[PDB]
Amino acid sequence: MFTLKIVVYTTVTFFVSLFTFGFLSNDASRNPNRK
Amino acid sequence: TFRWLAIHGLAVPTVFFLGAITSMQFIQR
Amino acid sequence: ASAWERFCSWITSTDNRLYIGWFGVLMIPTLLTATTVYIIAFVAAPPVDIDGIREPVAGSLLYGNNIITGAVIPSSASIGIHFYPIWEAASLDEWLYNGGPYQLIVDHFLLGVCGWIGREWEFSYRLGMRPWISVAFTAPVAAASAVFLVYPIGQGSFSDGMPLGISGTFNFMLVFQAEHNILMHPFHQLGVAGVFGGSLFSAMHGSLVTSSLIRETTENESANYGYKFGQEEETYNIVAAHGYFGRLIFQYASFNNSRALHFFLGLWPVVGIWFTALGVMTMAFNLNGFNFNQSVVDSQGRVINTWADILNRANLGMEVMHERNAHNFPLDLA
Amino acid sequence: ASGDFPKQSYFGAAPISAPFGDTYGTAGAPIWEKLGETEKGIFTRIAQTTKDQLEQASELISLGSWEASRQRLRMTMYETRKSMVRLTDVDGSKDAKDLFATFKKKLEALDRALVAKDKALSIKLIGDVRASYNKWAATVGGV
Amino acid sequence: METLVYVFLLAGTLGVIFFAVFFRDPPRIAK
Amino acid sequence: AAGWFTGNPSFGKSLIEYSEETKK
Amino acid sequence: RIPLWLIATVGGTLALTVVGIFFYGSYSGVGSSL
Amino acid sequence: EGTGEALGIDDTRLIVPVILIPVITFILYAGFASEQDNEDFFDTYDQRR
Amino acid sequence: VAGRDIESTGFAWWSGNSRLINVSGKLLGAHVAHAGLMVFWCGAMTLFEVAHYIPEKPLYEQGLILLPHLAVLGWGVGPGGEIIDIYPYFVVGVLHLISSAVLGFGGVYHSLIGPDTLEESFPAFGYDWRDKNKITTILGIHLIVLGIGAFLLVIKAMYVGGIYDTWAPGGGDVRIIDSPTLNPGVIFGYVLKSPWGGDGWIVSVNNMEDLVGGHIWIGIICIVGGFWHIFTKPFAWARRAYVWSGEAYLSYSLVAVSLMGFIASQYSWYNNTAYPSEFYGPTGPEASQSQAFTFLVRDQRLGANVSSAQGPTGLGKYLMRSPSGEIILGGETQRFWDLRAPWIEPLRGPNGLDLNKIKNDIQPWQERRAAEYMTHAPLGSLNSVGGVATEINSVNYVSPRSWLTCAHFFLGFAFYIGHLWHAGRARAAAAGFEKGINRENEPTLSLRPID
Amino acid sequence: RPFSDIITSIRYWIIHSITIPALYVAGWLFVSTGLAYDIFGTPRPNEYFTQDRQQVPLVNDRFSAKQELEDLTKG
Amino acid sequence: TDLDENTRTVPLDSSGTTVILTPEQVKRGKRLFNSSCGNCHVGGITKTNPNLGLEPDALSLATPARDNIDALVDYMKNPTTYDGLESIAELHPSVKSADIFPKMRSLSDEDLFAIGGHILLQPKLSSEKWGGGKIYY
Amino acid sequence: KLPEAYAVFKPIIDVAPVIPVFFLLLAFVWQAAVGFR
Ligand code: CLA
Ligand code: CLA
Ligand code: CLA
Ligand code: CLA
Ligand code: CLA
Ligand SMILES: CC1=CCCC(C)(C)[C@H]1/C=C/C(C)=C/C=C/C(C)=C/C=C/C=C(C)/C=C/C=C(C)/C=C/C1=C(C)CCCC1(C)C
Ligand SMILES: CC1=CCCC(C)(C)[C@H]1/C=C/C(C)=C/C=C/C(C)=C/C=C/C=C(C)/C=C/C=C(C)/C=C\C1=C(C)CCCC1(C)C
């Protein structure tokens, strides 16, 4: 049960961190009208 | 008079029924 | 020229067959988990004690259900709206006894559809198209949150959310009508107007566009091939359809402007479904539809029935027969 | 019957189906008066029982029961404040009101001690609370 | 045994969906 | 230039239309 | 000759008044439970 | 459940992933960030990547 | 007409306020006039409640929603949550109504005759949406103001009269919160608690010490953050992560305020400490547990042993065990076993409802409270017919909790929709395709075909 | 001619300051006279029940429907 | 039928004397019943204790019999159990317990009279609705 | 109820909370007055 808990925490944190630091990586510039 | 006929066939019953309904609000059992 | 930059370029790439993007990073795992657990629980899952009275209800195909009667049963009423992941159960068997898969599927699916809203916005930004298709999607999502999440929150139990099945959906409808009188609640009436008007305007718009198609096709050939993908010219005469619809009703009613027409098409069902989702959200906290029962009495004061009373009789039959063994007290306050 | 006009009132309060007018205070003076026989008896009973409740609270404090000790101050004592207000107003005395406020503050301090699980302060403050309550009891009189 | 038929039909619908998404006729602009 | 006119020459064309095209 | 904004204002005011009279009749007299 | 642990962390083990995985992601993001022109601009958004 | 028509602005009348984005003074007038509207409604509505308040019924049975707030703050209420005086409510109403005149005059002034743009006549107040430092200074000033408001609540609870504690010893009463909890592990322990059953996140405040201490924390936080933003500029990680336009700031405020609307709706629905049940009426869980309590007392009085009584399904008709083992009221109240109210805690031991207290020592006032809260459940219709949907038209009643919760859930969802609209438009307008796709350079035609 | 062109015309309003209220009041006296209850057969608030007729009236035959209607509506 | 005097005549005392309620009296009685006790006694039932309703059968079989204006009015000030052996003024709204029941504070003798008149008038209006419950809604 | 000295102004306070709705309506009339610029 705890093993499943820590695995799910690992997965959730991984994807949430990817989302967080991906939208923080100057996402507004990723448009076809840049330059 | 066809314009008159259409618009007034719609209107005259409408105002008649609205007056009746506004009166019917006061029937008070 | 950095690994994170390459990863961000790949995630936000318009070259993948299916766009991922940053909202897709959250959507794809959540939606895939919800799909997997839903398929596994629908084909094979033990009966679930939905009402918290040790009376399990079967919802899986292997336990004697068909596609119409099958469902992932809502959680047990004993749980309430407590979080019930797998690791909070003494065993997986008793996780399945109390309908934990419903909580898992509902949470992952709600997060996934939120990610779908955001991903619809995102692609549009990459495309350079205007936003707001996302705003239209919210209305379907809002209804899903209203039935799966907000109604449990207001009533205080995940047993009260809609079952993930067809017959369970009908059960949730009938119980909702019995307890809240959703039909007389004006937001549901606005939703009915929204869906009926959406069908009406869909049929009307399709009929008028198909009716005024410009001749670009031979007689031994489907008319649809008269349109070439990516062409610059209009494929039908807006003037012809506009004039026909003006003669049909009156000139002023017709939408001579096409952009206003399509805004209205996007507006009517979206606003209707927003209103009915909000109506379910408000009846979650027991602000019910209208109650005109015994509203007409004679001069003596005895009740002359109306159609509201006859509807009340059906609501009362559903009320008394729903969850026959779950209630020990006369009022259905929960 | 065949030509009888429907009744019609134009925003009038006279008709049976008119919604205008108050429901209370229309047909006479109230029967009820403040501090009646039965209600004064009820408040007297609550005030008298509060001594025993305080004693039981002190016993629970002595045994270290924290949940039960806290609940003892809100079980049969939830009407203590209203009863004390009603009987103090009957007394109409400044010293009674001062002892009333002192009991309230001491009881609140005792609760703040009980959440902290402070045995010594809890014992001291239940003793002070009982002493202040008995002082107010001797003041207002009849309990 | 009906679970076999139900599962087969649902899997067939999912397969048709898969092939429709990933083996569609590619849109191209005419000339 | 992007390549939208290649890879599926028969798209959006009926049997008769594409057949008559292929025979020029 | 009469500005149509004033006509619209007065007409909408009167229509809303009629609907409000209907609402009052809904809270008064016959059709009300009282 | 219903115990009130912060972020559901009842075991101290759960914190190791919760704090480290953002830190590895932060380290990877810093290589991107340090490569950018981090001076101010007067615009609705930065067009420089 | 210049700046007030579609020709010179590109905005129709129905998007009329969108013409105020770059007009700073006129936009200031818009805001101040609308704030005047807010305070006007507050004063007028609370005066309306005072005028329609009858001293017989309780507040929750009369459809009163605003006077409960003042009663909770500690004005004109005695022990037991009995509203003894309603003159402070009148004073608050007249003060808000009179202040509305000043705010309305200011808003109308700045909207009509004040300078259009403040950036040339009043450079201190003028701003540009893209000037990050000035906007952050404005944000910091407003944060300091919010901290001052939090400290005003703190001063009211601590020094000036005190607030109404429904959990007070004896009955609930207005008392001075002399020792708020300033421990970070409690205040921010609430903030990191889960929102699900039993946890409740920040809706689960069960005492006024935590409330007042965390308001002290909010005041300190807001003032420190405001001074931080006044003397600082956004960092490079933030400067690339946001759209720096007025519509983007509006969308951010919209999402925050929508979240607050949802949280406030659940505060009114579930909490009974900041929203005591003697002013706002019973919660749904409170009413259900009260029904179970009333029939427990009735059947015990009639000879039944409630602890040993078996329901239809084998579970307890009156008393059973929660999934964690606590002794709890039975029936469909089993879901509401997390209720904690000052009228039912008195019978609660460490292991749940104490059977000895439940059998021998249920007081009459508890039965009265349970009956009142049973008969006044949040159930009701839109036309205010109290009770279940299948009830008859004799009882005119919908709980204030239902009204507040439904209204603020509605507005929270609506403001999420507004956030989505305005954030999308901010991104599109910053990138420069909020008017359509350029027929000259269409991005899709440059993209390689998929499949 | 266009709708707004008629509505803003004074003649329109000289006609409809008198014509519209006339029928708006005609409906009022139509129902206040009790004439609707007689034309349409609708019971008044004091006609749903009567002596020996404390139960709901119902027509139970197709062809004698008029006969039993008078019999029930003798009043 | 009109609200004739046959409907408005209700028993007054235990011997058998009757009293004709006025339309003002029955109007005030209906309003007072719905405002002061409708929350528990909507429809002639008892939500908190459905074993004892307000239908004339239960009132007649009460000890003392409560099927008259004087007996009902006495119950509104000296409420007792169904057998009339224990006082339940601390658990029932009564004019003598209006401090703990703040709805009974404003009622006068005429208000109690009107409420009793409403209670006794209801069963004459419907054959089974008063005290019938859901089955006759 | 209002304080005695103010009860005479009850009919104004009865219409007082509803003016904000009218404010919105006023906007439309203003835009109707300039012909919806
Ligand atoms: C909260 C509501 C609100 C507020 C505060 C504002 C405020 C504003 N709007 Mg408006 N607006 C609103 C809702 C609101 N709007 C709505 C719902 C719509 C849709 C119909 C519009 C549509 C709209 C358009 C189309 C335009 C505005 C514009 C404006 C601005 C200039 C007004 C002007 O010069 O008009 C002049 C108006 C008049 C001379 C008419 C008289 C109005 C009086 C002052 C109202 C009386 C108020 C009160 C009773 C006085 C109390 C006085 C006090 C001392 C007690 C102003 C800041 C304009 C703008 O952006 O300009 C740059 C503009 O073009 N608005
Ligand atoms: C959002 C609020 C707001 C903002 C940002 C502004 C901004 C501005 N206003 Mg003002 N204004 C406002 C509200 C606002 N106004 C309101 C509500 C009114 C109606 C009363 C006015 C009426 C008004 C007029 C009539 C004029 C301005 C003008 C100005 C400009 C100059 C201000 C100045 O010189 O200050 C100087 C500051 C003072 C004199 C205030 C001193 C402080 C006094 C003594 C009060 C102390 C209060 C105390 C600290 C509060 C205790 C709090 C406690 C209860 C907790 C500036 C652009 C001028 C302008 O634009 O000219 C073209 C101008 O003529 N405003
Ligand atoms: C109205 C409030 C407000 C606003 C609009 C802003 C706006 C800003 N602040 Mg912030 N700030 C505020 C108050 C506010 N601040 C306060 C009161 C403080 C405390 C002193 C700070 C301290 C502060 C610092 C130290 C910094 C900023 C910075 C910033 C910028 C980046 C914000 C960001 O990306 O957050 C990102 C937010 C997160 C990554 C998550 C926040 C972490 C908390 C603990 C989450 C806890 C979980 C939560 C309870 C979950 C449920 C919430 C629910 C409501 C949804 C931006 C200009 C940065 C800057 O450039 O300053 C110059 C910066 O470095 N702010
Ligand atoms: C039609 C518009 C409308 C109306 C009429 C209301 C009405 C209400 N809202 Mg609001 N609300 C609205 C729209 C509206 N809302 C919208 C669109 C949202 C966004 C979704 C919200 C979000 C919202 C939230 C989040 C909350 C409310 C709440 C409330 C209630 C309390 C108002 C209040 O005091 O706010 C707060 C007032 C202020 C911020 C003004 C400043 C207050 C100062 C600082 C207080 C000083 C106090 C101090 C003790 C005074 C003495 C000082 C000294 C002598 C010691 C009230 C019923 C509350 C409620 O009960 O929810 C259930 C609540 O929590 N509303
Ligand atoms: C903080 C609140 C706030 C602020 C300051 C603004 C400000 C603005 N909005 Mg708005 N907006 C808000 C909340 C807010 N919005 C919310 C909550 C939503 C979601 C419903 C929207 C949705 C929205 C849209 C769709 C648009 C704007 C636009 C605008 C601009 C012009 C609006 C105007 O002149 O209206 C004048 C006012 C009127 C014409 C009166 C209309 C009254 C309606 C018909 C009544 C409500 C109908 C119905 C009940 C709503 C259901 C909503 C559903 C989600 C539940 C302006 C910058 C427009 C723009 O040009 O943006 C740049 C625009 O296109 N807003
Ligand atoms: C003293 C007393 C005793 C007993 C009780 C009583 C109530 C009588 C009390 C008296 C109170 C009195 C007289 C209070 C006075 C308050 C007054 C006059 C308040 C007025 C406030 C003004 C406000 C909001 C103004 C806001 C205006 C706005 C946005 C206008 C909007 C608009 C603008 C700006 C431009 C475009 C058009 C549009 C949209 C309409
Ligand atoms: C005041 C009170 C009353 C009752 C008792 C109680 C203890 C609760 C007490 C105390 C309450 C306290 C201390 C409450 C504090 C609440 C706090 C700190 C809430 C935090 C909210 C933070 C939020 C949303 C942050 C979201 C930020 C975001 C997405 C930022 C933007 C972005 C990021 C980070 C990455 C992706 C791109 C994007 C979108 C640009």
Ligand SMILES: [Cl-]
């Ligand atoms: Cl039950």
